[PDB]
């Protein structure tokens, strides 16, 4: 029965996704901000993908890190084969959607993962940040303001719905994101930005004492 296997796989995955920490990504004046609840110091859920394309995930670590690696592979092979400015967040999002659909229909167990691909404009350029959310089945959604992944997404999504403000500075967006995430110190937060002002590589982690000052 295609219907019972579809529904059952769906439940399996959605469980494992709610069975994990929460990550948020939101647009602010200088680009995009990733704020994840992460206790470990070695295992990370936010990553550079390409010059202006960032990546956050929530679920089963070995699998979304498998996707992290595959995406890095893809982006670099394209950038070298054509050029750096040709790889876009949109292509990456699309590849993740195809791959999660193929995994969801063909492999034994579906990837209990939820992905967010983020992109900002190039240096000295003007364009709105783009957020895409790719779910375990292959579905892809275009988000204008913020993405919330993993755990219980309703309260965080609503708190962000009340607190969100376009063109908020880095400190304000960090306060809003940590606040809505609570609905945690520098020893339990993974924070990174896609700073649109950097010349080439936009991704930049905010850790330690600098993070301490920001929050």
């Amino acid at each position: 029965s295609p219907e019972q296997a579809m529904r059952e796989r769906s439940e399996l995955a959605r469980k494992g996704i709610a069975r994990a920490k929460s990550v948020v990504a939101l647009a602010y004046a200088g680009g995009v901000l990733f704020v994840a609840e992460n206790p470990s110091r070695s295992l990370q859920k936010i990553s550079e993908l390409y010059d202006r394309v960032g990546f956050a995930a929530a679920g089963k670590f070995n699998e979304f890190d498998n996707l992290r690696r595959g995406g890095i592979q893809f982006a670099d092979t394209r950038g070298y084969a054509y050029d750096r400015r040709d790889v876009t967040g949109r292509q990456l999002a699309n590849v993740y959607a195809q791959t999660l659909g193929t995994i969801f229909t063909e492999q034994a167990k579906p990837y209990e993962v939820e992905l967010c691909v983020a992109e900002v404009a190039h240096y000295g350029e003007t364009k709105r940040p783009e957020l895409y959310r790719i779910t375990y089945d292959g579905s892809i959604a275009d988000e204008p303001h913020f993405v919330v992944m993993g755990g219980t997404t309703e309260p965080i999504a609503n708190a962000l719905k009340e607190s969100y403000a376009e063109n908020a500075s880095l400190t304000d967006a960090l306060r809003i994101a940590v606040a809505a995430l609570r609905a945690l110190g520098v020893a339990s937060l993974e924070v990174a930005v896609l700073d649109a002002n950097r010349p080439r590589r936009a991704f930049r982690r905010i850790t330690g004492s600098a993070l301490q000052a920001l929050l």
Binding site: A81, Y82, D83, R85, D86, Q91
Partner: protein, 223 residues
């Protein structure tokens, strides 16, 4: 063979002669060596006739193929790269005497200043490329005479038309000092071919305009 390309305020122009030889023997009087590979580029190829026409064809196919898959043309940088990789791929056959060198003209729509969005790119046999900055380039057996003509004539280039005139003249001098480059044939009415690219794309110059320019030059030289 000789193919010149020069930027002008607002665009780029690219012209090529018509002769094709075998040794001392004139075998083709109307070959077209400048193609419109896409709405914003044009590609001249000097060298072996087969390798040349095939390069042009296959490159046009590849540009348009990626455009259909991704829904957006490559940047001018990506195009430069693909052409370079093709050229690098022909290197063994080029050492076997099947050499073909392309000269690529394009109009970058994404450049900041429209008046200087014109682009000229030259390649060697080993796939390396170079973005020309002194405003003009040429390829083929007459290239040195063409460049030495444009160096002096280039201060006269102020728009699309004057740039076209200068292109035709540079070709005339290439042909004047080299026998493998055909000049304007007034008897049979065969003139160089020309492509103009600007903000609105690439269009072939209709033959009549090249004819009038050639006849102006010829009346100027004879007194």
């Amino acid at each position: 063979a000789t193919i010149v390309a020069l930027k002008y305020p607002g665009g780029v122009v690219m012209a090529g002669d018509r002769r094709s030889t075998q040794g001392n023997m004139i075998s083709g009087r109307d070959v077209r060596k400048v193609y419109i590979t896409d709405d914003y580029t044009a590609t001249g190829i000097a060298g072996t006739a087969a390798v040349a026409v095939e390069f042009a064809r296959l490159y046009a196919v590849e540009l348009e193929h990626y455009e259909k898959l991704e829904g957006v043309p490559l940047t001018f940088a990506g195009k430069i790269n693909r052409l370079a990789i093709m050229v690098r791929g022909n290197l063994a056959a080029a050492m076997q005497g099947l050499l073909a060198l392309p000269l690529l003209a394009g109009y970058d729509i994404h450049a900041s200043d429209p008046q200087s969005a014109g682009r000229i790119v030259s390649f060697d046999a080993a796939g390396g490329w170079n973005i020309e900055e002194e405003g003009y380039q040429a390829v083929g057996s007459g290239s040195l005479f063409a460049k030495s003509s444009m160096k002096k004539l280039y201060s006269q280039v102020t728009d699309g038309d004057s740039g076209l005139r200068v292109a035709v003249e540079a070709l005339y001098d290439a042909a004047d000092d080299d026998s493998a480059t055909g000049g304007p044939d007034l008897v049979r009415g065969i003139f160089p071919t020309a492509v103009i690219i600007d903000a609105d794309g690439a269009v072939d110059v209709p033959e009549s305009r090249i004819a009038e320019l050639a006849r102006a030059i010829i009346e100027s030289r004879s007194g």
